Amino acid sequence: SLTVKAYLLGKEDAAREIRRFSFCCSPEPEAEAEAAAGPGPCERLLSRVAALFPALRPGGFQAHYRDEDGDLVAFSSDEELTMAMSYVKDDIFRIYIKEK
Amino acid sequence: SLTVKAYLLGKEDAAREIRRFSFCCSPEPEAEAEAAAGPGPCERLLSRVAALFPALRPGGFQAHYRDEDGDLVAFSSDEELTMAMSYVKDDIFRIYIKEK
Amino acid sequence: SLTVKAYLLGKEDAAREIRRFSFCCSPEPEAEAEAAAGPGPCERLLSRVAALFPALRPGGFQAHYRDEDGDLVAFSSDEELTMAMSYVKDDIFRIYIKEK
Amino acid sequence: SLTVKAYLLGKEDAAREIRRFSFCCSPEPEAEAEAAAGPGPCERLLSRVAALFPALRPGGFQAHYRDEDGDLVAFSSDEELTMAMSYVKDDIFRIYIKEK
Amino acid sequence: SLTVKAYLLGKEDAAREIRRFSFCCSPEPEAEAEAAAGPGPCERLLSRVAALFPALRPGGFQAHYRDEDGDLVAFSSDEELTMAMSYVKDDIFRIYIKEK
Amino acid sequence: SLTVKAYLLGKEDAAREIRRFSFCCSPEPEAEAEAAAGPGPCERLLSRVAALFPALRPGGFQAHYRDEDGDLVAFSSDEELTMAMSYVKDDIFRIYIKEK
Amino acid sequence: SLTVKAYLLGKEDAAREIRRFSFCCSPEPEAEAEAAAGPGPCERLLSRVAALFPALRPGGFQAHYRDEDGDLVAFSSDEELTMAMSYVKDDIFRIYIKEK
């Protein structure tokens, strides 16, 4: 299991709302194309953040993760998630949520 | 139940009058053609706003709702109402009333 | 699905009315000549904008879309629509409606 | 491919209408005299501008292109087109359309 | 090569039309009397300006070039052309076209 | 592997969006002309920045890299990339993305 | 090798674009008249600046170099280049590019 921490950013980049959800270490929830048609972790995470942060649009936001440099990188692909977890050594995945 | 908030706009787009009414989560009040002859939610809402905002014409106004972008979209169809509620996560439906 | 945003322009090129409609990602609604006799997306869009913007003529208007440069290009062909969508990366197609 | 941008000029040399079309890098569309009887690019471009700018005559207009100096030079020959493209480094060919 | 810029003058000495053509640095196009019977550059230039400026007569115009003083000097001889180019240091030969 | 960091610049040269991608130390992805027809690293990088920075045009931007002096040099050739990497000692290639 | 830094100047003499290229310490690239017909360094430099600064004309610009006083001197001869390098002690040749 891997708890993912999300940080909501308003206009002054100030923490509006905080919420976390339990995630599986598994690559993807489903295997069939009826349930995985390419993505998996990204589409899963972006789903929870939507229901968790109703303050903004359901799918009208980008999640930005810090890199080795610290800069924000708006991720939106499973390939980018596998990389983002490579940074964190612990079982906590922090990310910066922003509404488009 | 779903409370619908209406905002009256004069000439300077300034809030003239504020009023709310309790609405049902149901699709339509009646089923017979004697009582539903196509519309339902739109005709119902537009009815209340008229009696609630006597300051203007009874049926000589358009209700504009914000979209995902924020822009105003003068709705006047049930199909447009079902969509407008899809935006709001809460049980409060805000709309911008304007007299023609 | 693809929401198309239209902007009504008066005399001072000021936003008169705003309205949006849900569109299909599909090429055309119908295939038979009784229902597609050449056009498809253009004739479909121009149909909605008419019913949506009754403020002007039903078919006496031209829809202008921004290009790579930003300039307005009065489109009126399906071949031009497929190109206009190539600009927008998102699922939102913005256009400038003007009455002839 | 090479997008050609045209600028319509009224009486006050003000941009009346804007429209663009995709062109081929190829010298000419056809090779046979039944389809190329001397011209090629000029006759092709002047054809599109006509259908694109119905506001004026079909073949009663001259397209003027800026030179190294900036002055307008009413072109109407393929030999003049090959030269006009030599100015622009990009894949965008701008021209000033005027009705005779 | 030497590009020659021509300026058309109406009644108010206002630039009616602008057009340029590529010229050769060579003295004359041909050597035989069947093709050079005295003139060369003048007859060549005056030929292009005619086809380029159909707005006026084919051979019923005089081309005036600025001198060291700036005044206009209606040239019409090859001997006068060789001199006119002596003024311009660049590869651009400007001249004032006027219809008789 | 070599991570390339890109910096998006708006109007006030302020960091709009940040995103990184994993690159190969290899000269080029492919060898055949069907896949390398001259370029390689430049065309590859410019491809990712496009998909990564959808905020602007797909191929209507120039990437500027700092030199020994610090000044920005809009690169757009493989020969320029091999040189740009010669500056950075680490495995991180920073660049300034700007939309045309 | 000698890196030459060029500075593009708009209307307000503000740095529009910055770009550098690697040059050889050698007098000239070629020796034959088919490849050196008098010039060498000037014609070489002016060639690169053209391809590097497509923002302006290919050969319709003058490069101005600072002197011992600091004033700008529009150079355009090999004899002037050998002198310009005599000022700089380092392996960096700075110059001010301006479009005619």
| Radius of gyration for chain F, computed over Cα atoms and rounded to the nearest angstrom | 13
Q: Nearest-CA distance from D89 to chain G in Å?
A: 6
Phi first, then psi: what are they for C7, rounded to 5°?
Answer: -120, 115
**Interface with F, mutate which of G1, G17, G93 (most F CBs under 10 A):** G17
The residue of chain F with its CA nearest to that of G16 is F72
Token pair of C31 as six digits: 């295939």
> Can you state the angle between helices A41-52 and A78-87, rounded to 10 degrees?
80
Residue A46 near residue A59, CB atoms below 8 Å: yes
CB atoms near residue A61 (< 10 Å): 20
C-beta atoms of D68 and E17 within 8 A: no
Residue G56 near residue G99, CB atoms below 8 Å: yes
Residue F4 near residue F23, CB atoms below 8 Å: yes
Q: Please write down the long-range contacts of E56-65, taking CB distance under 8 Å and 24 or more positions apart.
A: E56/E8, E56/E99, E57/E99, E57/E100, E60/E99, E60/E100, E61/E97, E61/E98, E61/E99, E61/E100, E62/E98, E62/E100, E63/E6, E63/E95, E63/E96, E63/E97, E63/E98, E64/E95, E64/E96, E64/E98, E65/E94, E65/E95, E65/E96
3-state SS assignment for residue C45 = helix
3-state SS assignment for residue B45 = helix
Helices (H), chain E: 41-52, 78-87
Q: D32 touching G, CB under 8 A?
A: no
| Radius of gyration for chain E, computed over Cα atoms and rounded to the nearest angstrom | 13
Phi first, then psi: what are they for F38, rounded to 5°?
Answer: 125, -75
Q: Nearest-CA distance from C68 to chain F in Å?
A: 7
Residue F56 near residue F41, CB atoms below 8 Å: no
Task: Could you list the beta-strand ranges (E) of F24-90.
Answer: 61-66, 72-75
Q: What is the DSSP string of chain D?
A: -EEEEEEEE-SSS-EEEEEEEEE-SSS-S--STTT-SS--HHHHHHHHHHHH-TTS-SS-EEEEEE-SS--EEEE-SHHHHHHHHHH--SSEEEEEEEE-
CB atoms near residue A32 (< 10 Å): 7
Give buried/exposed letters for G47-85 (b at 16+ CB in 10 A, else e).
ebbbebbeebebeebebbbeeeeeebeebeebeebeebb
Which residues in chain D are contacts of E92 at CB distance < 8 A? 68-69
- From CA D61, how far away is CA D50, in angstroms rounded? 9
Both ends of chain B: CA-CA distance in Å?
A: 30
Q: Nearest-CA distance from G49 to chain F in Å?
A: 12
Residue E47 near residue E58, CB atoms below 8 Å: no
Give the resolution value in Å. Answer: 10.3
- Sequence-ordered list of residues with C-beta below 8 angstroms from that of D53, at least 6 positions apart, any chain: D6, D8, D17, D19, D61, D97, D99
Q: What is the DSSP string of chain G?
A: -EEEEEEEE-SSS-EEEEEEEEE-SSS-S--STTT-SS--HHHHHHHHHHHH-TTS-SS-EEEEEE-SS--EEEE-SHHHHHHHHHH--SSEEEEEEEE-
Phi first, then psi: what are they for F7, rounded to 5°?
Answer: -120, 115
Q: How does strand D15-23 pair with strand D61-66?
A: unpaired
- Sequence-ordered list of residues with C-beta below 8 angstroms from that of G85, at least 6 positions apart, any chain: G2, G93
CB atoms near residue E86 (< 10 Å): 9
Match 């699905």 to its residue by tokens.
C1
Residues 52-91 of B with CB under 8 A from A: 68, 89-90
Q: How does strand G72-75 pair with strand B61-66?
A: unpaired
Closest CA to F10 of F53, F59, F71, F41: F53
Residue G10 near residue G18, CB atoms below 8 Å: no
Closest CA to B45 of B86, B94, B88: B94
CB atoms near residue G23 (< 10 Å): 18
Chains that touch E (3 or more CB pairs under 8 A): D
The C-alpha angle with vertex D14 and arms to D10 and D16, in degrees rounded to 5, equals: 65
- Sequence-ordered list of residues with C-beta below 8 angstroms from that of A94, at least 6 positions apart, any chain: A4, A5, A7, A65, A66, A88
Token pair of D61 as six digits: 């207009």
Helices (H), chain A: 41-52, 78-87
- Residue F29's H or E segment, with its range, is none
- From CA E46, how far away is CA E42, in angstroms rounded? 6
Residue C97 near residue C9, CB atoms below 8 Å: yes
Q: Say which experimental method was used.
A: cryo-EM
Match 């045209």 to its residue by tokens.
D6
- From CA D13, how far away is CA F17, in angstroms rounded? 40
Token pair of G38 as six digits: 């008098």
CATH architecture assigned to D1-100: Roll (3.10)
> Can you state the angle between helices B41-52 and B78-87, rounded to 10 degrees?
80
| Length, in residues, of chain C | 100
Which residues in chain D are contacts of G54 at CB distance < 8 A? 89-90
- From CA E98, how far away is CA D9, in angstroms rounded? 25
User: Are G and B neighbours with ≥3 CB pairs closer than 8 A?
Assistant: no
Token pair of D17 as six digits: 């209408």
Token pair of C75 as six digits: 């489109």
